[PDB]
Amino acid sequence: SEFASMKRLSEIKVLPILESLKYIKHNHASVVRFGDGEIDLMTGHSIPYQDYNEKLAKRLQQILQTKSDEKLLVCLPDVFSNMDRYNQNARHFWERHFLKYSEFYLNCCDAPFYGSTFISRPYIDLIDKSPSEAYFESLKELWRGKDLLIVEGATSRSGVGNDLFVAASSIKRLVCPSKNAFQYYDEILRLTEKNAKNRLILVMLGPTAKVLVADLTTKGYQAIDLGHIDSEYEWYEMGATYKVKLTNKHTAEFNYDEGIELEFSQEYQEQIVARIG
Ligand SMILES: O=c1ccn([C@@H]2O[C@H](COP(=O)(O)OP(=O)(O)O)[C@@H](O)[C@H]2O)c(=O)[nH]1
């Protein structure tokens, strides 16, 4: 009975977006998020912007086994209870996902609580988009007045052309490959450490981001895996009802990165400390 499995998995306890944010701020915690692509990778599959890699899969598994505490919040998709928050397409996607990974989800995740992987996904799949403004305003309090190090891909351009990070005191960016970043992992970690002094680190880098956040946290940094936050903010700012493609940068779930018409944004260019790849 697949239904039986659905009920059993509702034993997994995720702190919803706003509650996750309170945990993060109260504890100054790093944040690592596991989504469908991470489970795909951990179980042996390649995903649109990251080929399967055995070392990556192993690290992801180790990280998911780490208990959430004062230093790190480990997050899962917030779909195990109150699935009715999400639109029909999203509900179907996620149920098929966690049923397909019954073997995995049944044995992987018996921590007392997890954060929400959807702290980066606060808008587009919701039926009631009313709390979204509150979600983004709470997110923004993470970086208001902070010096940021943003580690992201060449097409991510997080906050470029919008006001998401306007209140950050400064931004430096380590710009990595838009796909298959794990290939360059050692260099990414090395340069992130070098540039992280007195900065809050934000990471938008697919599966590679999870390892980076974990390794940085072990070395004593606060690093926050924010994934596709920019896409959701862009959709939110334009009052989108569906996932419309952005023309000037990467768009979540258009992960082949086709049809992009880049611009030269001087402010963005001046923030770039180095490119990897
Ligand atoms: O090798 C990679 C893998 C992904 N990304 C970027 O990682 C972000 C999405 O990360 P994640 O999959 O964690 O997002 P989520 O959907 O879970 O929020 C996007 O900006 C992608 O462009 C990247 O730059 N290089």
Side-chain angles (χ1 to χ4, degrees), residues 15-73:
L15 296 169
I17 293 166
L18 286 173
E19 302 308 317
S20 283
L21 288 164
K22 297 166 179 171
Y23 184 107
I24 299 160
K25 298 170 186 182
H26 184 67
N27 298 291
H28 310 309
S30 286
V31 179
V32 59
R33 302 175 306 98
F34 287 78
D36 59 299
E38 285 62 55
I39 312 311
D40 286 337
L41 280 160
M42 278 181 295
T43 62
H45 285 130
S46 295
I47 70 172
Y49 42 55
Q50 179 62 59
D51 294 344
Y52 176 73
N53 176 287
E54 190 162 15
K55 165 120 170 59
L56 174 55
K58 177 191 174 71
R59 285 296 289 119
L60 289 173
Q61 293 182 73
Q62 291 175 333
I63 296 165
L64 184 59
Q65 295 297 121
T66 315
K67 238 79 163 192
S68 288
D69 61 18
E70 161 194 334
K71 295 183 176 181
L72 179 67
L73 183 63

Short mmCIF file of all heavy atoms in Angstrom, two decimals, residues 15-73:
data_model
loop_
_atom_site.label_atom_id
_atom_site.label_comp_id
_atom_site.label_asym_id
_atom_site.label_seq_id
_atom_site.Cartn_x
_atom_site.Cartn_y
_atom_site.Cartn_z
N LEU A 15 10.35 21.71 10.30
CA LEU A 15 9.96 23.06 10.67
C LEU A 15 9.67 23.87 9.41
O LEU A 15 10.57 24.07 8.60
CB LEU A 15 11.12 23.76 11.39
CG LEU A 15 11.58 23.21 12.74
CD1 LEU A 15 12.89 23.85 13.14
CD2 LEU A 15 10.53 23.49 13.77
N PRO A 16 8.43 24.36 9.25
CA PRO A 16 8.09 25.13 8.04
C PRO A 16 8.96 26.38 7.92
O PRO A 16 9.61 26.78 8.89
CB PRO A 16 6.63 25.52 8.27
CG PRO A 16 6.12 24.60 9.33
CD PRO A 16 7.30 24.31 10.20
N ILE A 17 8.96 26.99 6.73
CA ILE A 17 9.84 28.11 6.42
C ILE A 17 10.07 29.13 7.55
O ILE A 17 11.22 29.39 7.93
CB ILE A 17 9.36 28.88 5.18
CG1 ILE A 17 9.49 28.03 3.92
CG2 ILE A 17 10.16 30.16 5.00
CD1 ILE A 17 8.73 28.62 2.74
N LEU A 18 9.01 29.73 8.07
CA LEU A 18 9.20 30.79 9.06
C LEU A 18 9.82 30.27 10.34
O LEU A 18 10.62 30.95 11.00
CB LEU A 18 7.89 31.51 9.37
CG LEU A 18 7.37 32.46 8.29
CD1 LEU A 18 5.98 32.97 8.65
CD2 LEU A 18 8.33 33.62 8.08
N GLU A 19 9.46 29.04 10.69
CA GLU A 19 9.98 28.39 11.89
C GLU A 19 11.45 28.02 11.71
O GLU A 19 12.25 28.18 12.61
CB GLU A 19 9.13 27.16 12.23
CG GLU A 19 7.66 27.46 12.44
CD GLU A 19 7.42 28.57 13.44
OE1 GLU A 19 8.10 28.59 14.49
OE2 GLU A 19 6.56 29.44 13.17
N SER A 20 11.80 27.51 10.53
CA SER A 20 13.21 27.29 10.21
C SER A 20 14.02 28.57 10.34
O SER A 20 15.14 28.56 10.87
CB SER A 20 13.35 26.73 8.79
OG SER A 20 13.01 25.36 8.77
N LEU A 21 13.47 29.68 9.87
CA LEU A 21 14.21 30.93 9.91
C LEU A 21 14.47 31.37 11.36
O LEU A 21 15.54 31.87 11.68
CB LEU A 21 13.51 32.01 9.08
CG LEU A 21 13.66 31.71 7.58
CD1 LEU A 21 12.68 32.49 6.72
CD2 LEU A 21 15.11 31.95 7.12
N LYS A 22 13.49 31.15 12.24
CA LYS A 22 13.69 31.46 13.65
C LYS A 22 14.81 30.63 14.27
O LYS A 22 15.61 31.13 15.06
CB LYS A 22 12.39 31.27 14.44
CG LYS A 22 11.27 32.21 14.01
CD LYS A 22 9.92 31.77 14.57
CE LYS A 22 8.80 32.72 14.15
NZ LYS A 22 7.46 32.18 14.51
N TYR A 23 14.85 29.34 13.92
CA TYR A 23 15.92 28.46 14.36
C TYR A 23 17.28 29.00 13.90
O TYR A 23 18.21 29.09 14.70
CB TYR A 23 15.70 27.05 13.82
CG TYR A 23 16.71 26.01 14.28
CD1 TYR A 23 16.36 25.04 15.22
CD2 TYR A 23 18.00 25.98 13.77
CE1 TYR A 23 17.27 24.08 15.64
CE2 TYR A 23 18.92 25.02 14.19
CZ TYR A 23 18.55 24.08 15.13
OH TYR A 23 19.44 23.12 15.54
N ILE A 24 17.38 29.34 12.62
CA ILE A 24 18.63 29.82 12.06
C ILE A 24 19.13 31.09 12.75
O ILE A 24 20.29 31.18 13.12
CB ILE A 24 18.51 30.08 10.55
CG1 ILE A 24 18.16 28.78 9.82
CG2 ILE A 24 19.82 30.65 10.01
CD1 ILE A 24 17.55 28.98 8.45
N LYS A 25 18.24 32.06 12.91
CA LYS A 25 18.63 33.34 13.51
C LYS A 25 18.98 33.19 14.98
O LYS A 25 19.92 33.81 15.47
CB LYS A 25 17.52 34.36 13.35
CG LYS A 25 17.20 34.68 11.92
CD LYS A 25 15.95 35.51 11.80
CE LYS A 25 15.57 35.70 10.34
NZ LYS A 25 14.37 36.55 10.21
N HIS A 26 18.21 32.38 15.69
CA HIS A 26 18.42 32.20 17.12
C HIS A 26 19.78 31.54 17.38
O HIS A 26 20.47 31.90 18.33
CB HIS A 26 17.29 31.36 17.72
CG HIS A 26 17.37 31.21 19.21
ND1 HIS A 26 17.20 32.26 20.08
CD2 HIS A 26 17.61 30.12 19.97
CE1 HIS A 26 17.32 31.83 21.32
NE2 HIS A 26 17.58 30.53 21.28
N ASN A 27 20.17 30.61 16.51
CA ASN A 27 21.39 29.83 16.72
C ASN A 27 22.60 30.25 15.88
O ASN A 27 23.70 29.71 16.05
CB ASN A 27 21.10 28.34 16.51
CG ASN A 27 20.07 27.81 17.49
OD1 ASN A 27 20.34 27.70 18.69
ND2 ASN A 27 18.89 27.49 16.99
N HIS A 28 22.40 31.22 15.00
CA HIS A 28 23.42 31.60 14.03
C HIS A 28 23.88 30.36 13.27
O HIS A 28 25.07 30.19 13.03
CB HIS A 28 24.63 32.26 14.71
CG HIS A 28 24.27 33.35 15.67
ND1 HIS A 28 23.43 34.40 15.32
CD2 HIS A 28 24.64 33.58 16.95
CE1 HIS A 28 23.30 35.21 16.35
NE2 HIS A 28 24.03 34.74 17.35
N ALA A 29 22.93 29.51 12.91
CA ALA A 29 23.24 28.20 12.35
C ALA A 29 23.56 28.24 10.85
O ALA A 29 23.02 29.06 10.12
CB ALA A 29 22.08 27.23 12.59
N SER A 30 24.45 27.35 10.41
CA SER A 30 24.59 27.06 8.99
C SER A 30 23.33 26.32 8.59
O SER A 30 22.60 25.81 9.44
CB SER A 30 25.80 26.19 8.73
OG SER A 30 26.99 26.95 8.87
N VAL A 31 23.09 26.25 7.29
CA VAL A 31 21.90 25.56 6.79
C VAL A 31 22.27 24.73 5.57
O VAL A 31 22.87 25.25 4.63
CB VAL A 31 20.80 26.54 6.38
CG1 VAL A 31 19.59 25.79 5.86
CG2 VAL A 31 20.40 27.41 7.56
N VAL A 32 21.93 23.45 5.60
CA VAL A 32 22.10 22.61 4.41
C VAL A 32 20.76 21.98 4.06
O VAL A 32 20.06 21.46 4.92
CB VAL A 32 23.18 21.52 4.63
CG1 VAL A 32 22.83 20.62 5.81
CG2 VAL A 32 23.37 20.71 3.36
N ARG A 33 20.39 22.04 2.78
CA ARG A 33 19.06 21.61 2.36
C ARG A 33 19.16 20.40 1.44
O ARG A 33 19.95 20.40 0.49
CB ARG A 33 18.33 22.74 1.63
CG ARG A 33 18.15 24.04 2.43
CD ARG A 33 17.51 25.16 1.58
NE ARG A 33 18.32 25.33 0.39
CZ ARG A 33 18.04 24.80 -0.79
NH1 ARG A 33 16.89 24.16 -1.01
NH2 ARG A 33 18.92 24.94 -1.77
N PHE A 34 18.33 19.39 1.69
CA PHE A 34 18.23 18.25 0.79
C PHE A 34 16.93 18.30 0.03
O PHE A 34 15.86 18.33 0.63
CB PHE A 34 18.35 16.94 1.57
CG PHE A 34 19.75 16.67 2.04
CD1 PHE A 34 20.26 17.33 3.15
CD2 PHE A 34 20.56 15.78 1.36
CE1 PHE A 34 21.56 17.11 3.56
CE2 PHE A 34 21.85 15.55 1.77
CZ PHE A 34 22.36 16.22 2.88
N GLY A 35 17.03 18.30 -1.30
CA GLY A 35 15.87 18.28 -2.17
C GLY A 35 15.86 17.03 -3.03
O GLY A 35 16.63 16.10 -2.79
N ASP A 36 14.97 17.00 -4.01
CA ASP A 36 14.83 15.79 -4.81
C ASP A 36 16.10 15.40 -5.56
O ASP A 36 16.41 14.22 -5.71
CB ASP A 36 13.66 15.91 -5.79
CG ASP A 36 13.82 17.08 -6.73
OD1 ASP A 36 13.88 18.22 -6.24
OD2 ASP A 36 13.86 16.85 -7.95
N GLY A 37 16.84 16.40 -6.04
CA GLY A 37 18.07 16.12 -6.77
C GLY A 37 19.13 15.48 -5.91
O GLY A 37 19.92 14.66 -6.38
N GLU A 38 19.17 15.85 -4.63
CA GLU A 38 20.14 15.24 -3.71
C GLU A 38 19.82 13.77 -3.48
O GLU A 38 20.72 12.94 -3.43
CB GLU A 38 20.21 15.98 -2.37
CG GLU A 38 20.97 17.32 -2.49
CD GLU A 38 20.29 18.29 -3.45
OE1 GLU A 38 19.08 18.59 -3.26
OE2 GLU A 38 20.96 18.75 -4.41
N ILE A 39 18.53 13.45 -3.36
CA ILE A 39 18.17 12.06 -3.16
C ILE A 39 18.44 11.28 -4.45
O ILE A 39 18.94 10.16 -4.41
CB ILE A 39 16.70 11.88 -2.72
CG1 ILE A 39 16.34 12.82 -1.57
CG2 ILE A 39 16.44 10.43 -2.37
CD1 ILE A 39 17.31 12.82 -0.43
N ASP A 40 18.12 11.89 -5.60
CA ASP A 40 18.48 11.29 -6.89
C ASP A 40 19.96 10.93 -6.95
O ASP A 40 20.32 9.81 -7.30
CB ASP A 40 18.17 12.24 -8.05
CG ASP A 40 16.69 12.35 -8.35
OD1 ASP A 40 15.92 11.43 -8.00
OD2 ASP A 40 16.30 13.36 -8.97
N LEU A 41 20.81 11.90 -6.64
CA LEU A 41 22.25 11.67 -6.64
C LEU A 41 22.67 10.60 -5.64
O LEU A 41 23.42 9.69 -5.98
CB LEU A 41 23.00 12.97 -6.35
CG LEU A 41 23.13 13.87 -7.58
CD1 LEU A 41 23.42 15.28 -7.15
CD2 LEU A 41 24.21 13.35 -8.51
N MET A 42 22.19 10.70 -4.40
CA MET A 42 22.59 9.75 -3.37
C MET A 42 22.22 8.32 -3.71
O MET A 42 22.84 7.38 -3.22
CB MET A 42 21.99 10.13 -2.01
CG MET A 42 22.80 11.19 -1.29
SD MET A 42 22.11 11.61 0.31
CE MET A 42 20.57 12.32 -0.18
N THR A 43 21.19 8.15 -4.55
CA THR A 43 20.74 6.81 -4.93
C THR A 43 21.25 6.38 -6.31
O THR A 43 20.85 5.33 -6.82
CB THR A 43 19.21 6.69 -4.88
OG1 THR A 43 18.62 7.61 -5.81
CG2 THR A 43 18.70 6.99 -3.48
N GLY A 44 22.13 7.18 -6.90
CA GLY A 44 22.83 6.76 -8.10
C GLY A 44 22.42 7.39 -9.43
O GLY A 44 22.78 6.87 -10.48
N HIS A 45 21.70 8.50 -9.38
CA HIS A 45 21.21 9.14 -10.61
C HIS A 45 21.87 10.48 -10.88
O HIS A 45 22.22 11.22 -9.97
CB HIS A 45 19.69 9.35 -10.55
CG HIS A 45 18.90 8.10 -10.76
ND1 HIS A 45 17.88 7.70 -9.92
CD2 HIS A 45 18.96 7.16 -11.74
CE1 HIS A 45 17.36 6.58 -10.36
NE2 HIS A 45 17.99 6.22 -11.46
N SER A 46 22.03 10.79 -12.16
CA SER A 46 22.49 12.11 -12.55
C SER A 46 21.30 13.07 -12.65
O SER A 46 20.19 12.65 -12.97
CB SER A 46 23.22 12.03 -13.89
OG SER A 46 24.41 11.27 -13.77
N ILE A 47 21.54 14.34 -12.36
CA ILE A 47 20.49 15.36 -12.36
C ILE A 47 20.92 16.49 -13.30
O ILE A 47 22.08 16.59 -13.65
CB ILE A 47 20.20 15.87 -10.92
CG1 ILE A 47 21.35 16.72 -10.39
CG2 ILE A 47 19.93 14.69 -9.98
CD1 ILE A 47 21.02 17.41 -9.05
N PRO A 48 19.97 17.35 -13.74
CA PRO A 48 20.27 18.28 -14.84
C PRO A 48 21.58 19.08 -14.72
O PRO A 48 22.32 19.17 -15.72
CB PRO A 48 19.05 19.21 -14.84
CG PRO A 48 17.93 18.29 -14.40
CD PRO A 48 18.54 17.33 -13.40
N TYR A 49 21.89 19.63 -13.56
CA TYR A 49 23.14 20.38 -13.42
C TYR A 49 24.23 19.71 -12.60
O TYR A 49 25.16 20.38 -12.15
CB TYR A 49 22.93 21.84 -12.95
CG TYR A 49 21.91 22.10 -11.85
CD1 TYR A 49 21.96 21.45 -10.62
CD2 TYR A 49 20.93 23.07 -12.03
CE1 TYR A 49 21.02 21.73 -9.61
CE2 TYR A 49 19.99 23.36 -11.05
CZ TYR A 49 20.05 22.69 -9.84
OH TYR A 49 19.10 22.99 -8.89
N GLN A 50 24.13 18.40 -12.41
CA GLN A 50 25.20 17.66 -11.73
C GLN A 50 25.16 16.18 -12.06
O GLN A 50 24.23 15.47 -11.68
CB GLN A 50 25.14 17.88 -10.22
CG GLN A 50 26.21 17.11 -9.44
CD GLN A 50 27.61 17.52 -9.82
OE1 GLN A 50 27.97 18.69 -9.68
NE2 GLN A 50 28.41 16.58 -10.33
N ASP A 51 26.18 15.72 -12.77
CA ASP A 51 26.37 14.31 -13.09
C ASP A 51 26.57 13.52 -11.80
O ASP A 51 27.12 14.04 -10.83
CB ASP A 51 27.63 14.11 -13.93
CG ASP A 51 27.53 14.73 -15.29
OD1 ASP A 51 26.41 15.06 -15.73
OD2 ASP A 51 28.59 14.87 -15.93
N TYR A 52 26.15 12.26 -11.80
CA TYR A 52 26.45 11.39 -10.68
C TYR A 52 27.95 11.35 -10.42
O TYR A 52 28.76 11.35 -11.35
CB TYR A 52 25.93 9.97 -10.92
CG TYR A 52 26.32 9.03 -9.80
CD1 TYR A 52 25.70 9.11 -8.56
CD2 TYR A 52 27.31 8.07 -9.98
CE1 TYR A 52 26.05 8.27 -7.53
CE2 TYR A 52 27.67 7.21 -8.95
CZ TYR A 52 27.04 7.32 -7.73
OH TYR A 52 27.38 6.48 -6.70
N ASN A 53 28.31 11.33 -9.14
CA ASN A 53 29.70 11.26 -8.71
C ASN A 53 29.69 10.52 -7.39
O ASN A 53 28.93 10.88 -6.48
CB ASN A 53 30.27 12.67 -8.57
CG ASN A 53 31.69 12.68 -8.02
OD1 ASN A 53 31.91 12.43 -6.84
ND2 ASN A 53 32.66 12.98 -8.89
N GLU A 54 30.49 9.46 -7.28
CA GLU A 54 30.44 8.59 -6.12
C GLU A 54 30.89 9.27 -4.82
O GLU A 54 30.33 9.01 -3.76
CB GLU A 54 31.27 7.32 -6.36
CG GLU A 54 31.07 6.26 -5.30
CD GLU A 54 31.53 4.89 -5.76
OE1 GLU A 54 32.27 4.82 -6.77
OE2 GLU A 54 31.15 3.88 -5.12
N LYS A 55 31.91 10.11 -4.91
CA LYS A 55 32.39 10.83 -3.74
C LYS A 55 31.34 11.83 -3.25
O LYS A 55 31.11 11.99 -2.05
CB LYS A 55 33.72 11.53 -4.04
CG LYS A 55 34.12 12.58 -3.02
CD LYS A 55 35.44 12.24 -2.36
CE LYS A 55 35.96 13.41 -1.53
NZ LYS A 55 35.00 13.79 -0.45
N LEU A 56 30.70 12.51 -4.20
CA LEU A 56 29.62 13.43 -3.86
C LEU A 56 28.47 12.70 -3.18
O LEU A 56 27.94 13.16 -2.17
CB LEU A 56 29.12 14.14 -5.13
CG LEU A 56 27.89 15.04 -5.00
CD1 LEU A 56 28.11 16.10 -3.93
CD2 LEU A 56 27.56 15.69 -6.34
N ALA A 57 28.07 11.56 -3.74
CA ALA A 57 26.95 10.80 -3.19
C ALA A 57 27.26 10.38 -1.75
O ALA A 57 26.40 10.46 -0.87
CB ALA A 57 26.65 9.58 -4.05
N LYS A 58 28.49 9.94 -1.52
CA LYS A 58 28.91 9.51 -0.20
C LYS A 58 28.89 10.68 0.79
O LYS A 58 28.38 10.55 1.90
CB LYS A 58 30.31 8.90 -0.28
CG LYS A 58 30.89 8.48 1.05
CD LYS A 58 32.36 8.14 0.89
CE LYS A 58 33.03 7.84 2.22
NZ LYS A 58 32.58 6.55 2.78
N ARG A 59 29.43 11.83 0.39
CA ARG A 59 29.42 13.00 1.26
C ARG A 59 27.99 13.43 1.57
O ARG A 59 27.66 13.72 2.72
CB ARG A 59 30.21 14.17 0.64
CG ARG A 59 31.73 14.03 0.69
CD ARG A 59 32.29 14.01 2.12
NE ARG A 59 32.19 15.31 2.78
CZ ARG A 59 31.50 15.53 3.90
NH1 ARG A 59 30.85 14.53 4.48
NH2 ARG A 59 31.46 16.74 4.44
N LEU A 60 27.13 13.48 0.56
CA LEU A 60 25.74 13.85 0.81
C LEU A 60 25.11 12.92 1.85
O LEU A 60 24.44 13.39 2.77
CB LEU A 60 24.93 13.81 -0.48
CG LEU A 60 25.22 14.93 -1.47
CD1 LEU A 60 24.45 14.66 -2.76
CD2 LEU A 60 24.86 16.30 -0.89
N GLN A 61 25.33 11.62 1.73
CA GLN A 61 24.79 10.69 2.71
C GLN A 61 25.31 10.97 4.12
O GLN A 61 24.56 10.89 5.10
CB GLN A 61 25.09 9.24 2.32
CG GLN A 61 24.35 8.82 1.06
CD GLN A 61 24.62 7.39 0.70
OE1 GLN A 61 24.13 6.47 1.35
NE2 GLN A 61 25.40 7.18 -0.35
N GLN A 62 26.59 11.29 4.23
CA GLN A 62 27.17 11.54 5.54
C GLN A 62 26.53 12.78 6.15
O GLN A 62 26.23 12.83 7.34
CB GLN A 62 28.67 11.73 5.42
CG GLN A 62 29.43 10.46 5.05
CD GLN A 62 30.90 10.73 4.81
OE1 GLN A 62 31.28 11.85 4.44
NE2 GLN A 62 31.74 9.73 5.05
N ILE A 63 26.32 13.79 5.31
CA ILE A 63 25.81 15.07 5.78
C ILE A 63 24.38 14.91 6.29
O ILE A 63 24.02 15.43 7.33
CB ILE A 63 25.92 16.15 4.69
CG1 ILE A 63 27.40 16.40 4.37
CG2 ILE A 63 25.27 17.44 5.15
CD1 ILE A 63 27.64 17.16 3.08
N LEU A 64 23.57 14.16 5.55
CA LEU A 64 22.19 13.90 5.94
C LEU A 64 22.10 13.14 7.27
O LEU A 64 21.08 13.20 7.95
CB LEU A 64 21.48 13.12 4.83
CG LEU A 64 19.98 12.85 5.05
CD1 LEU A 64 19.21 14.16 5.20
CD2 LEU A 64 19.42 12.05 3.88
N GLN A 65 23.17 12.44 7.65
CA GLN A 65 23.19 11.70 8.91
C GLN A 65 23.52 12.60 10.10
O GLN A 65 23.38 12.19 11.25
CB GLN A 65 24.17 10.53 8.85
CG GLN A 65 23.78 9.47 7.84
CD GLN A 65 22.46 8.80 8.18
OE1 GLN A 65 21.51 8.84 7.40
NE2 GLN A 65 22.40 8.18 9.35
N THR A 66 23.97 13.81 9.81
CA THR A 66 24.33 14.77 10.85
C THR A 66 23.08 15.31 11.52
O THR A 66 22.16 15.76 10.84
CB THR A 66 25.12 15.96 10.27
OG1 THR A 66 26.13 15.49 9.37
CG2 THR A 66 25.78 16.76 11.39
N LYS A 67 23.05 15.27 12.85
CA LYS A 67 21.94 15.82 13.60
C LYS A 67 21.94 17.34 13.49
O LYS A 67 22.99 17.97 13.52
CB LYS A 67 22.04 15.42 15.07
CG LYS A 67 20.83 14.66 15.60
CD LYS A 67 20.87 13.21 15.17
CE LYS A 67 19.93 12.36 16.02
NZ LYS A 67 20.16 10.91 15.81
N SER A 68 20.76 17.94 13.36
CA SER A 68 20.64 19.39 13.44
C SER A 68 20.95 19.83 14.86
O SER A 68 20.46 19.24 15.83
CB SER A 68 19.23 19.85 13.06
OG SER A 68 18.98 19.72 11.67
N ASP A 69 21.77 20.87 14.99
CA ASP A 69 22.06 21.45 16.29
C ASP A 69 22.26 22.96 16.19
O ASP A 69 21.74 23.61 15.28
CB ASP A 69 23.29 20.80 16.93
CG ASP A 69 24.54 20.98 16.09
OD1 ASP A 69 24.56 21.88 15.22
OD2 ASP A 69 25.51 20.22 16.31
N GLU A 70 23.02 23.50 17.13
CA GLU A 70 23.29 24.92 17.20
C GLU A 70 24.08 25.40 15.99
O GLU A 70 23.98 26.56 15.59
CB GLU A 70 24.06 25.22 18.50
CG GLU A 70 24.81 26.55 18.52
CD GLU A 70 25.82 26.63 19.66
OE1 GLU A 70 25.61 25.95 20.69
OE2 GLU A 70 26.82 27.36 19.52
N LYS A 71 24.85 24.51 15.39
CA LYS A 71 25.79 24.94 14.36
C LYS A 71 25.26 24.71 12.95
O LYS A 71 25.62 25.44 12.03
CB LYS A 71 27.13 24.22 14.52
CG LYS A 71 27.84 24.58 15.82
CD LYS A 71 29.20 23.91 15.91
CE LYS A 71 29.93 24.36 17.17
NZ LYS A 71 31.29 23.76 17.30
N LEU A 72 24.37 23.74 12.81
CA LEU A 72 23.88 23.36 11.48
C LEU A 72 22.43 22.87 11.51
O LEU A 72 22.09 22.00 12.31
CB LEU A 72 24.77 22.25 10.91
CG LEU A 72 24.38 21.72 9.53
CD1 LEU A 72 24.59 22.81 8.49
CD2 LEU A 72 25.18 20.47 9.19
N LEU A 73 21.59 23.45 10.65
CA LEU A 73 20.23 22.96 10.46
C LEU A 73 20.19 22.15 9.16
O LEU A 73 20.53 22.67 8.10
CB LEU A 73 19.24 24.12 10.36
CG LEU A 73 17.76 23.79 10.21
CD1 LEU A 73 17.25 23.04 11.44
CD2 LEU A 73 16.91 25.05 9.97
#
